[PDB]
Design a protein around this ligand. Sequence first.
Ligand code: FES
Ligand code: FES
Ligand code: FES
Ligand code: FES
Ligand code: FES
Ligand code: FES
Ligand SMILES: [Fe+2]
Ligand SMILES: [Fe+2]
Ligand SMILES: [Fe+2]
Lengths: 389, 390, 389, 104, 104, 107
Amino acid sequence: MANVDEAILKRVKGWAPYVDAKLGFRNHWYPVMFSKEINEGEPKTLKLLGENLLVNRIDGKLYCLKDRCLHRGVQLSVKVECKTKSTITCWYHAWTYRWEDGVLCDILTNPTSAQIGRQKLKTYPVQEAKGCVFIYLGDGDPPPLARDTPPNFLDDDMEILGKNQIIKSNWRLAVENGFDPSHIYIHKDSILVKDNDLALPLGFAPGGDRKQQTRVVDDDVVGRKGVYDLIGEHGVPVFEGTIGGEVVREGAYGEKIVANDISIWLPGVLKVNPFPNPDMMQFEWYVPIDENTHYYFQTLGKPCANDEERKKYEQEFESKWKPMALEGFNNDDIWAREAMVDFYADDKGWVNEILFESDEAIVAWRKLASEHNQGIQTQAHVSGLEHHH
Amino acid sequence: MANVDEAILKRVKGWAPYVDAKLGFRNHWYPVMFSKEINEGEPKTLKLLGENLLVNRIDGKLYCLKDRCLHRGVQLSVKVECKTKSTITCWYHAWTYRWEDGVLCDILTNPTSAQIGRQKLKTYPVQEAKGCVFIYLGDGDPPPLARDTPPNFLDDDMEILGKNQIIKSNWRLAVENGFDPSHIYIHKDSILVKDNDLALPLGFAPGGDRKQQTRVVDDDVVGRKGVYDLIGEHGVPVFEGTIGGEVVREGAYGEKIVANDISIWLPGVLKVNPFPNPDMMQFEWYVPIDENTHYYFQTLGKPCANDEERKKYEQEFESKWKPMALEGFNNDDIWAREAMVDFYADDKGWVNEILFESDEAIVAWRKLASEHNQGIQTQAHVSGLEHHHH
Amino acid sequence: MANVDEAILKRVKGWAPYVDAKLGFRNHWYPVMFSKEINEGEPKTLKLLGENLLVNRIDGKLYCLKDRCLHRGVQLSVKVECKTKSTITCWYHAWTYRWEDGVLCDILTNPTSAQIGRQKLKTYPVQEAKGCVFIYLGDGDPPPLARDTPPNFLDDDMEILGKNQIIKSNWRLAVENGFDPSHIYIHKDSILVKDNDLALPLGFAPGGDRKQQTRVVDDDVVGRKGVYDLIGEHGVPVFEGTIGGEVVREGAYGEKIVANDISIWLPGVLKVNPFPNPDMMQFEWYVPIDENTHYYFQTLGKPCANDEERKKYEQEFESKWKPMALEGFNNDDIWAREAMVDFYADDKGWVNEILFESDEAIVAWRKLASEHNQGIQTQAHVSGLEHHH
Amino acid sequence: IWLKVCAASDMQPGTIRRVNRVGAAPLAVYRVGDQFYATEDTCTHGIASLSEGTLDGDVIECPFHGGAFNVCTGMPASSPCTVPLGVFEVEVKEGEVYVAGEKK
Amino acid sequence: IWLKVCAASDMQPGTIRRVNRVGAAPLAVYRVGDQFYATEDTCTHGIASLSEGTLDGDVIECPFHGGAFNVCTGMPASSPCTVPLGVFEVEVKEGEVYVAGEKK
Amino acid sequence: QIWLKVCAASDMQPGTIRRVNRVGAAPLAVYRVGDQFYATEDTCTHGIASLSEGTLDGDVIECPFHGGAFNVCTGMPASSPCTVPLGVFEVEVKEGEVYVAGEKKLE
Ligand code: FES
Ligand code: FES
Ligand code: FES
Ligand code: FES
Ligand code: FES
Ligand code: FES
Ligand SMILES: [Fe+2]
Ligand SMILES: [Fe+2]
Ligand SMILES: [Fe+2]
């Protein structure tokens, strides 16, 4: 709420909430690390939606506290003091909080303080699923994690493996690039295309009406909100790039057909199926860290019936899929996102961009996101909500 | 004024002037370096209250001129040209000023210029005391230095030694941390505690009413304004820190009793007595350089009756007190100050902080500072005061 | 065009347009590099008046396109794809533009797009003269280059040699320093003074009336607009600087008379004649890159009747003039400009500066520039012009 | 040639009406007071449908970025639009609105 | 049980009176016009005394940070306050002000 | 040279300024405030601007260079950036003729 110039928001009537959502959407689950990255009794720091957080594993369960003391606003993590299994004590004046509910249960520097038991450090729900750590950066009782994950990600037999890193671009630039039907052009020379014999066009000549270009899902059995890119349904794949009539580039004529269906879902996760191989799927999140950075949380899923297949899959992932696809294919997506930063940095790109046909997919996402997000994160949420009677 | 968003200042009615003083208080004396650091005819540059200054020693006496030529506003220090003993010539167009009164006395590029003798570069009073260089960053005739110094700092036999450095935090965060009764918790593991057998509690359980937690000084005959931390006069010291009623940390049970006499004084200097030893005193200033930094001017005083004694003290200072106390004890104060930067950087921390009992001392200081400061330094003082004919 | 606080512009009634021209004057020619730095088929990037541009040489002729794709605003230069001799293809979605008119002629990702042939990427005129590349950062058909060059620079027999670099200061601070009669004081210890036996005063005691201090040119048949510094016509040069009546510094008493004819011309080029030698001239531009930087385009001219003289001149330029003059003399101008940055950075210096007699020259320039510039560049020109109703 | 849009009575002044055409791009019909106009439906600055925009007098504002055009001349009225819109001929024969198959 | 605080006339309209309770947190009694209300005196956001704050209608403004509460419901009216204030019903009989012994 | 002949009181309209050039001396500025006449140095003390080219608002003259201003009666600064007082020269009208002092007033 109120993150962009009001004059700009007034102009983008089709999707003002989205353009305003610089810091991301509040009240959604977000993956931030893998389960194996946080061990028992070893608090870890991270920044999500502009908020500094602390995550700890106690008796195997994860807990999340805002990494900012209620007293003088210092990060507890500057000098972590976990003096009892269930609490954390601020290094400054020893205000002590319970990981379970964030209640200020003790103050070593003044055991008679009237503040004891009268204050609460913000806590956020944390759930582990498929080896991934999800945090509900929101208020109140959280909805099922399924609402904020693409279809099949939570399937029992779905084996998930991935990689996570910090990328220097606003989360929206990452989402739009990933769902961009015509951006496939930047992948024409990817080693995956040649090494995994993929069929990959340079783009698409749209067919049918604009309504047929996408399929918006307004509600799933679990309340999911997303959009499928159907440009290939009635569109013509372009395999020969011409300029003035002369052929200057060709797409890839591999035999492996991948990415039959691509969908983007709130709060901002893309599903490409099948990819990077006919028997696999790719689910990737673009998690807002702050207004200029995001976590590029990549995962590859493959149904595995037993420990035998999970083992083989893990070997194939480390030896081929991670380096050839997650890096060999998606690395080009990283600098593409970074390339759009300047144009949108002053929020003016949201007005001056000149869109063409395949962008109907992006527009559908912007509208869906604007209409169904569960809240706009504001700088005030970061410093402290403000209201004057 | 006009340093902080008015909406925020309206919210902190108890100490708005203090919250607005991001650049510090004008019209007060401030220490900026030690005498031995400025030698004859060796001009030195420094920034105080956001203003670039030049200090020089001529025939032993210190002079201070604003380091910004009246002409095109460049710093004279980019290329110093002291062509005569009593003057400095700007390297750009040679406008020449007298260190003694800042008067533009000559212009080498145009000896016929009408500006000659008709312009004056800002000068500030400079005074040396106890081996420390104090600059009165203010206008008009300065008050006695004693007004802006803690009691006993100027005593005849008090030998002063110290260290100075630039710290990355606003000066107010440094002042509050220093006068913060409960912050003593951050010093529980200091090498000084064990190595100097100190008795040091973890905190305090206040006793009595609010008024009794401090003693506001506004009756001092020399005019100094400050506050004494009396939390220990009715409060029970905390030596056993508990969580859920169980002891998880204890204080230090050393023999040496220290720091039971703590006071903060305008413009921003703390006095801890006795410290770091029962026969010594610590006086430290947190001098505003700009909105984000301050000089952490530390001094330790110990009465000495002669050169033999003051020499013994100096040796003890270099081999023990400086490394064990000034650094071994106060280094934790430095990162503690830095840790509060983010919360207060947007000026929102002044509204969102959740205070507890011992902060009564900090509140008293904020009120005293707001009511008795001699002026709010503004960005306009830095660029040039502005006024439009009414 | 509102680049500075209105309260400040209201105060500087004699030259508000100039004070507002923080990004430079639009609709003027500006030198940005030397011809030998741009080779056939090798596009080069640069920023001029805050705008990112791309220059390319095709069949020996130079072309300039704005380095920002119309689609999502990325710089084409991130990954240059010139697929045909006359075009450049954006690496992102393959929007293809013609170098000669900027027309969007093809889109490889969708050859049926309605945008093809309807959109046009901004182009700017480019002209090479005296081995220097000039770009007309303006709109509409350009005026003759001579209008924005000092007298004699384009003389047939005038051989031009020089160097260019990026300096960290607003272009105006560089211009004023260059035309500043009394700044000659900073050159009193230059090696060129002793090594080239120059006569050089420390300053000037002006004589005559205000009007006599300069010669404002607004009747040049070529349209040139500039000012001549005539302080020395009635003034007594200072060769003995005194303090308290005591001589503390002396000027240079060499035999070579130079820099007795100095003039500044829009859009911001200084002509010093004769300099650095009695038989040479110096022409230097202070080209706006952005509000904090400028190109210091230095050129030295010397009449040469044939290749023989040109080679000899070239040799001396490399062994003497460039190191002893352009660097040995002008290097002090570089940090002098930088020294003024802080005072003017907040625009307050334009109000608080305390000028003296010789600054009459600078004032004349400020007024000439304010009255005769061809346009004020604005941030909107950079992001995309804005207008309502 | 001409195509049947609607009855002049079916459009309240200040309203817009999208006209879908078979095998061709859509058009937009605007009723300004008691006069009717027509232009391409697609905004020249992107892929927006101008019929989903806001009409103020004889100026239509695009819902996407706030660009605008004069519906009579098709000329840009507000940034970021710069490319003139295609204008089509309209005729009201006997309380009935008609739009020309091609642009004037 | 009920605490006899003071005579209704001991308080001028729009004023606040702090009521100390040995072995208990102090209370604040507010006189809004000719009505009386009571809450805990300590601001829930810090150590400020609401009795030293500013009363605007039925809303008490904390002197420290500008946080505020509705003296009738005890609910926060302005940030940064987030924890509801303890409220004590008040009764005025025969010109004497009485405040409930325990929060309710 | 004590009194310099300027012009006829008639030659000046209320609220105007006249520049008085002097041989071998800095120029003066004579201001007519109503029917009263005042004079100061013509050169702004903040730079090299000619105050006679500025704007007179009542008894306050505004410099055309940076917006600084002075009270023409006292010569004291009225608006920043000016800080140095102007030299003031007595003016008297004898026989309908305006005369300005050749030397400035002193303290
Ligand atoms: S800032 Fe954490 S206990 Fe004081
Ligand atoms: S900037 Fe110092 S003499 Fe000109
Ligand atoms: S950003 Fe250039 S073709 Fe899409
Ligand atoms: S698509 Fe219409 S203004 Fe951009
Ligand atoms: S102590 Fe009351 S609003 Fe903070
Ligand atoms: S020269 Fe008059 S205000 Fe600056
Ligand atoms: Fe991609
Ligand atoms: Fe400390
Ligand atoms: Fe120079």
